[PDB]
Scaffold this active site. Structure first.
Site, PDB file in Angstrom:
ATOM      1  N   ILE A  73       0.901  -1.378  -0.122  1.00  0.00           N
ATOM      2  CA  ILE A  73      -0.112   0.299   0.089  1.00  0.00           C
ATOM      3  C   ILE A  73       0.973   1.279  -0.152  1.00  0.00           C
ATOM      4  CG2 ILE A  73      -1.527   1.301   1.186  1.00  0.00           C
ATOM      5  CD1 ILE A  73      -2.287  -1.433   2.504  1.00  0.00           C
ATOM      6  N   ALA A 111       8.982   2.995   6.225  1.00  0.00           N
ATOM      7  CA  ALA A 111       8.524   1.783   6.468  1.00  0.00           C
ATOM      8  C   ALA A 111       7.568   1.468   5.323  1.00  0.00           C
ATOM      9  CB  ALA A 111       7.392   1.696   7.851  1.00  0.00           C
ATOM     10  N   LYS A 112       7.562   0.090   4.924  1.00  0.00           N
ATOM     11  CA  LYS A 112       6.594  -0.566   4.006  1.00  0.00           C
ATOM     12  C   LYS A 112       5.443  -0.942   4.511  1.00  0.00           C
ATOM     13  N   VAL A 113       4.378  -0.801   3.863  1.00  0.00           N
ATOM     14  CA  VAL A 113       2.955  -1.207   4.305  1.00  0.00           C
ATOM     15  C   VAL A 113       2.369  -2.445   3.258  1.00  0.00           C
ATOM     16  CG1 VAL A 113       0.781  -0.642   5.118  1.00  0.00           C
ATOM     17  CG2 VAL A 113       2.554   0.992   5.177  1.00  0.00           C
ATOM     18  N   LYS A 116       2.626  -2.873   8.997  1.00  0.00           N
ATOM     19  CA  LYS A 116       3.668  -1.943   8.571  1.00  0.00           C
ATOM     20  C   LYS A 116       4.930  -2.626   9.133  1.00  0.00           C
ATOM     21  CE  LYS A 116       2.926   2.210  10.160  1.00  0.00           C
ATOM     22  NZ  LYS A 116       2.908   3.674  10.474  1.00  0.00           N
ATOM     23  N   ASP A 131       1.965  15.729  13.714  1.00  0.00           N
ATOM     24  CA  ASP A 131       2.240  15.580  12.366  1.00  0.00           C
ATOM     25  C   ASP A 131       0.689  15.538  11.768  1.00  0.00           C
ATOM     26  OD1 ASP A 131       3.697  15.649  10.148  1.00  0.00           O
ATOM     27  OD2 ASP A 131       3.647  13.345   9.787  1.00  0.00           O
TER      28      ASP A 131
HETATM   29  C1  LIG Z   1      -8.268   2.709   0.752  1.00  0.00           C
HETATM   30  C2  LIG Z   1      -7.199   2.365   1.037  1.00  0.00           C
HETATM   31  C3  LIG Z   1      -5.779   1.778   1.180  1.00  0.00           C
HETATM   32  N1  LIG Z   1      -5.030   2.867   2.011  1.00  0.00           N
HETATM   33  C4  LIG Z   1      -4.193   3.634   1.176  1.00  0.00           C
HETATM   34  O1  LIG Z   1      -4.429   3.653  -0.183  1.00  0.00           O
HETATM   35  C5  LIG Z   1      -3.459   4.490   2.079  1.00  0.00           C
HETATM   36  C6  LIG Z   1      -4.010   5.879   2.280  1.00  0.00           C
HETATM   37  N2  LIG Z   1      -3.028   3.873   3.246  1.00  0.00           N
HETATM   38  C7  LIG Z   1      -1.824   4.463   3.972  1.00  0.00           C
HETATM   39  C8  LIG Z   1      -0.425   3.732   3.623  1.00  0.00           C
HETATM   40  C9  LIG Z   1       0.352   3.149   3.408  1.00  0.00           C
HETATM   41  C10 LIG Z   1      -3.791   3.156   3.992  1.00  0.00           C
HETATM   42  N3  LIG Z   1      -3.466   2.755   5.272  1.00  0.00           N
HETATM   43  C11 LIG Z   1      -4.195   2.059   6.058  1.00  0.00           C
HETATM   44  N4  LIG Z   1      -4.258   1.564   7.170  1.00  0.00           N
HETATM   45  C12 LIG Z   1      -3.063   2.071   8.161  1.00  0.00           C
HETATM   46  C13 LIG Z   1      -3.632   2.296   9.504  1.00  0.00           C
HETATM   47  C14 LIG Z   1      -2.482   2.558  10.239  1.00  0.00           C
HETATM   48  F1  LIG Z   1      -2.665   2.790  11.313  1.00  0.00           F
HETATM   49  C15 LIG Z   1      -1.113   2.956   9.777  1.00  0.00           C
HETATM   50  O2  LIG Z   1      -0.210   3.552  10.546  1.00  0.00           O
HETATM   51  C16 LIG Z   1      -1.102   2.922   8.482  1.00  0.00           C
HETATM   52  F2  LIG Z   1       0.401   3.198   7.933  1.00  0.00           F
HETATM   53  C17 LIG Z   1      -1.831   2.344   7.550  1.00  0.00           C
HETATM   54  N5  LIG Z   1      -5.406   1.092   5.142  1.00  0.00           N
HETATM   55  C18 LIG Z   1      -5.556   1.521   4.045  1.00  0.00           C
HETATM   56  C19 LIG Z   1      -4.840   2.339   3.351  1.00  0.00           C
END
Ligand SMILES: C#CCN1C(=O)[C@@H](C)N(CC#C)c2nc(Nc3cc(F)c(O)c(F)c3)ncc21
Length: 309
Positions: free
Chosen positions: A17, A18-20, A35, A127
């Site tokens: 979607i 650090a790498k997620v 993450k 932030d």
């Molecule tokens: C719709 C959709 C998919 N989607 C995105 O397109 C983008 C905006 N991100 C951020 C990143 C990386 C997302 N993050 C999380 N969850 C999350 C929750 C947390 F608490 C985090 O710290 C995190 F990095 C991501 N779910 C979904 C998304």
């Protein structure tokens, strides 16, 4: 690689979607965001992110993305967090051009609720910006986490020792502006000119903003952090109270202490334990697989999906 051994016992990995990575929790079928942090790259920053994980363990609120699981290996740290399918806030503002005062209030009250709770737990976010605000399946806002300069308070830019609480209020003022206008109050192609614009604190007031909208912005956006509206005043501000007739609910509804009998019952059978014992273990809150499994059963329940593992 061995760093993924323990993690792949609990989750199936999907797309980046650090790498997620998007992932599926095997026991519940629930989607999560994982993450992946590499300890070697973090280096000198490692003890600081450790402090931040402990902060997130102390945050459970209806407007904060839930931490479900923390896993540490020789080289990595994995944080299993809530998947938010509705996307980030700025993408939403782009889809509608700008929000009406009414729909700004709906969104903004959730942001205020989350920030007030963060301050109540003794932290500042520091932030705040649209990228750190996502929509869940219920279209409710969840807060997570040179690039962030546009949302940075004057004092934060200068390097002067700041109070997190006052800096957060300024950031919220910027968010309020973006919600109602669809562009930033302080913006420039040149970084030096952006610095000067923020510290000056002068911005265009578009013709479509109500005088109450304009007053709230002036109170939030004060270059002097001592003249900046406090959180308590924000909770019951006339603009905020309008159409709701009750202050922002900042207190967490999501308790650490209370438990859901259905989810406890299902874990008891699966673990082959009693209700009292399963309740004792879950209430430990170690942020291990048990924590993850319990909180994901509670989410599965809320959607009206079956609870059977
Ligand atoms: C719709 C959709 C998919 N989607 C995105 O397109 C983008 C905006 N991100 C951020 C990143 C990386 C997302 N993050 C999380 N969850 C999350 C929750 C947390 F608490 C985090 O710290 C995190 F990095 C991501 N779910 C979904 C998304």
């Amino acid at each position: 690689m061995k760093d993924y051994d323990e993690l792949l016992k609990y989750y199936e990995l999907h797309e980046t979607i650090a790498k997620v990575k998007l992932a599926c929790h095997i026991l519940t079928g629930e989607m999560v965001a994982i993450k992946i942090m590499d300890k070697n790259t973090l280096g000198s920053d490692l003890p600081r992110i450790k402090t931040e994980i402990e902060a997130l363990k102390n945050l459970r609120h209806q407007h904060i993305c839930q931490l479900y699981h923390v896993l540490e290996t020789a080289n990595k740290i994995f944080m299993v967090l809530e998947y938010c399918p509705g996307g980030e806030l700025f993408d939403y503002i782009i889809s509608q051009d700008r929000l009406s005062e009414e729909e700004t209030r709906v969104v903004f009250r959730q942001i205020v609720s989350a920030v007030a709770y963060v301050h109540s737990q003794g932290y500042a976010h520091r932030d705040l910006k649209p990228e750190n605000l996502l929509f869940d399946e219920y279209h409710k806002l969840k807060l997570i986490d040179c690039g962030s300069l546009a949302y940075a308070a004057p004092e934060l830019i200068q390097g002067k020792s700041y109070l997190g609480s006052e800096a957060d209020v300024w950031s919220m003022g910027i968010l309020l502006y973006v919600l109602m206008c669809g562009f930033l109050p302080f913006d420039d192609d040149n970084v030096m000119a952006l610095y000067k614009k923020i510290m000056r604190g002068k911005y265009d007031v578009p013709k479509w903003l109500s005088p109450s909208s304009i007053l709230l912005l002036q109170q939030m956006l004060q270059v002097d952090p001592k003249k900046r509206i406090s959180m308590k005043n924000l909770l019951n501000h006339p603009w905020i109270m309008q159409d709701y007739n009750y202050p922002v609910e900042w207190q967490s509804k999501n308790p650490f202490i209370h438990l859901d009998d259905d989810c406890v019952t299902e874990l008891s059978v699966h673990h082959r334990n009693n209700r009292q014992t399963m309740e004792d273990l879950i209430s430990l809150w170690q942020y291990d697989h048990l924590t993850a499994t319990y909180l994901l059963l509670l989410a599965k329940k809320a959607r009206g999906k079956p609870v059977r593992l």
